[PDB]
Design an enzyme around this catalytic site. Structure first.
Site, PDB file in Angstrom:
ATOM      1  N   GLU A  15      45.646  22.133  63.292  1.00 16.06           N
ATOM      2  CA  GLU A  15      44.838  22.586  64.476  1.00 16.06           C
ATOM      3  C   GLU A  15      46.090  21.998  66.111  1.00 16.06           C
ATOM      4  O   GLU A  15      46.119  21.057  66.093  1.00 16.06           O
ATOM      5  CB  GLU A  15      43.833  22.071  64.691  1.00 16.06           C
ATOM      6  CG  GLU A  15      42.360  22.058  63.575  1.00 16.06           C
ATOM      7  CD  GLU A  15      42.160  23.514  63.561  1.00 16.06           C
ATOM      8  OE1 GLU A  15      42.332  24.195  64.777  1.00 16.06           O
ATOM      9  OE2 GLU A  15      41.021  23.872  63.204  1.00 16.06           O
ATOM     10  N   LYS A  17      29.402  25.753  57.114  1.00 14.59           N
ATOM     11  CA  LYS A  17      30.705  26.141  58.669  1.00 14.59           C
ATOM     12  C   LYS A  17      31.277  27.298  58.627  1.00 14.59           C
ATOM     13  O   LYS A  17      31.551  28.189  57.732  1.00 14.59           O
ATOM     14  CB  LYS A  17      31.328  24.627  57.500  1.00 14.59           C
ATOM     15  CG  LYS A  17      32.311  24.887  58.322  1.00 14.59           C
ATOM     16  CD  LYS A  17      32.293  23.258  59.688  1.00 14.59           C
ATOM     17  CE  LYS A  17      33.220  23.577  61.049  1.00 14.59           C
ATOM     18  NZ  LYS A  17      33.379  25.209  62.038  1.00 14.59           N
ATOM     19  N   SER A  18      31.022  27.643  59.721  1.00 16.07           N
ATOM     20  CA  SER A  18      31.746  29.147  60.315  1.00 16.07           C
ATOM     21  C   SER A  18      33.315  28.532  60.976  1.00 16.07           C
ATOM     22  O   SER A  18      33.847  27.615  61.020  1.00 16.07           O
ATOM     23  CB  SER A  18      30.879  28.940  61.247  1.00 16.07           C
ATOM     24  OG  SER A  18      30.597  28.770  62.672  1.00 16.07           O
ATOM     25  N   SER A  35      33.128  21.813  64.918  1.00 18.64           N
ATOM     26  CA  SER A  35      34.324  21.949  64.260  1.00 18.64           C
ATOM     27  C   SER A  35      35.324  21.637  65.323  1.00 18.64           C
ATOM     28  O   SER A  35      36.162  21.884  66.082  1.00 18.64           O
ATOM     29  CB  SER A  35      34.597  23.352  64.999  1.00 18.64           C
ATOM     30  OG  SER A  35      33.073  24.224  64.021  1.00 18.64           O
ATOM     31  N   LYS A  48      37.103  22.323  57.362  1.00 18.01           N
ATOM     32  CA  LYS A  48      36.565  20.973  57.826  1.00 18.01           C
ATOM     33  C   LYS A  48      36.140  20.690  56.597  1.00 18.01           C
ATOM     34  O   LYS A  48      35.712  19.679  56.523  1.00 18.01           O
ATOM     35  CB  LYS A  48      36.307  21.405  59.418  1.00 18.01           C
ATOM     36  CG  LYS A  48      37.541  20.786  60.222  1.00 18.01           C
ATOM     37  CD  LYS A  48      36.513  21.935  61.042  1.00 18.01           C
ATOM     38  CE  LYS A  48      38.086  21.404  62.155  1.00 18.01           C
ATOM     39  NZ  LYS A  48      37.889  22.833  63.223  1.00 18.01           N
ATOM     40  N   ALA A  81      36.400  30.596  63.421  1.00 22.34           N
ATOM     41  CA  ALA A  81      36.623  31.969  64.527  1.00 22.34           C
ATOM     42  C   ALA A  81      38.286  31.228  64.884  1.00 22.34           C
ATOM     43  O   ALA A  81      38.806  30.274  64.720  1.00 22.34           O
ATOM     44  CB  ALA A  81      36.020  32.050  65.400  1.00 22.34           C
ATOM     45  N   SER A  94      37.758  27.082  60.307  1.00 19.60           N
ATOM     46  CA  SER A  94      37.595  26.037  60.791  1.00 19.60           C
ATOM     47  C   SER A  94      36.861  25.721  59.633  1.00 19.60           C
ATOM     48  O   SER A  94      36.271  24.216  59.767  1.00 19.60           O
ATOM     49  CB  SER A  94      36.492  25.915  61.964  1.00 19.60           C
ATOM     50  OG  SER A  94      36.760  25.378  62.390  1.00 19.60           O
TER      51      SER A  94
END
Ligand SMILES: [Xe]
Ligand SMILES: [Xe]
EC number: 3.5.2.6
Length: 263
Positions: free
Chosen positions: A141, A209-210, A105, A48, A212, A45
């Protein structure tokens, strides 16, 4: 600081997986600290932010308007779509989609925005004309999270990402308005709680912004600093581990605790 890299070496040994790490001074632009900076990691993510940077570049050029409204169908909904699933009837504006993509996200939000710019190849062309010839997006996605080992698709390097983020945030490409917008979205991130923010003192600024995905992939990009102002950009990825998302979070958070302690 050396102690922070011990923590990355800590995390890598404990998780049994690759970990990349960058500390970058936002002012001088000089690398402060590095670890596996030239290895590839799945973006997940964290892409983005670059996606909305591209959208905002189109907005700057008049090829896009932030208030333009996009309608879509339920079939366009993919996994994890907290905001976009609620606006099937009234649609969403490009501004609302970037807000959902970055702060929550939202996956369907990402794909819709990808369609506006022309797909992953068009986003990769955008990054290429920014001086980033390393970072690439190939899939949509949610397939971009597959994180197949040594698969170069949908990957970046810690050094490419940190430099790209700095140009998007503090460069000359995007207008001053679009730069303030992109960082505003990152600052209102709602899905990075147990990571960098957990080790962050009161009064400090952070915009992040993370990410996974599959096969133990976890990451975070961030611009943070004390006194309410950002002063450094930090990038951290990991992939391959069989560890739970909980232990991944706690590893990123510990490295973050050392980063903060040694500022
Ligand atoms: Xe990590
Ligand atoms: Xe981190």
């Amino acid at each position: 600081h050396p102690e922070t890299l011990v923590k990355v070496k800590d995390a890598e040994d404990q998780l049994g997986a690759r970990v990349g790490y960058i500390e970058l001074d936002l002012n001088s632009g000089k690398i402060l600290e590095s670890f596996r900076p030239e290895e590839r990691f799945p973006m997940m993510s964290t892409f983005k932010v670059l996606l909305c940077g591209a959208v905002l570049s189109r907005v700057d050029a008049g090829q896009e308007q932030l208030g333009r409204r996009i309608h879509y169908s339920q079939n366009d909904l993919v996994e994890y779509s907290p905001v976009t699933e609620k606006h099937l009837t009234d649609g969403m504006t490009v501004r609302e989609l970037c807000s959902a993509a970055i702060t929550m996200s939202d996956n369907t939000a990402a794909n819709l925005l990808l369609t506006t710019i022309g797909g992953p190849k068009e986003l990769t062309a955008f990054l290429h004309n920014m001086g980033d010839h390393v970072t690439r997006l190939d899939r949509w996605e949610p397939e971009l999270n597959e994180a197949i080992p040594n698969d170069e698709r949908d990957t970046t390097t810690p050094a490419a990402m940190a430099t790209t983020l700095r140009k998007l945030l503090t460069g000359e490409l995007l207008t001053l308005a679009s730069r303030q917008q992109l960082i505003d979205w990152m600052e209102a991130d709602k899905v990075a709680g147990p990571l960098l923010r957990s080790a962050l003192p009161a009064g400090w600024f952070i915009a992040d912004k993370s990410g996974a995905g599959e096969r133990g992939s976890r990451g975070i990009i961030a611009a943070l600093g004390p006194d309410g102002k950002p002063s450094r950009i930090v990038v951290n990825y990991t992939t391959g581990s069989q560890a739970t998302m909980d232990e991944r979070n706690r590893q990123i958070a510990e490295i973050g605790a050392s980063l903060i302690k040694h500022w």
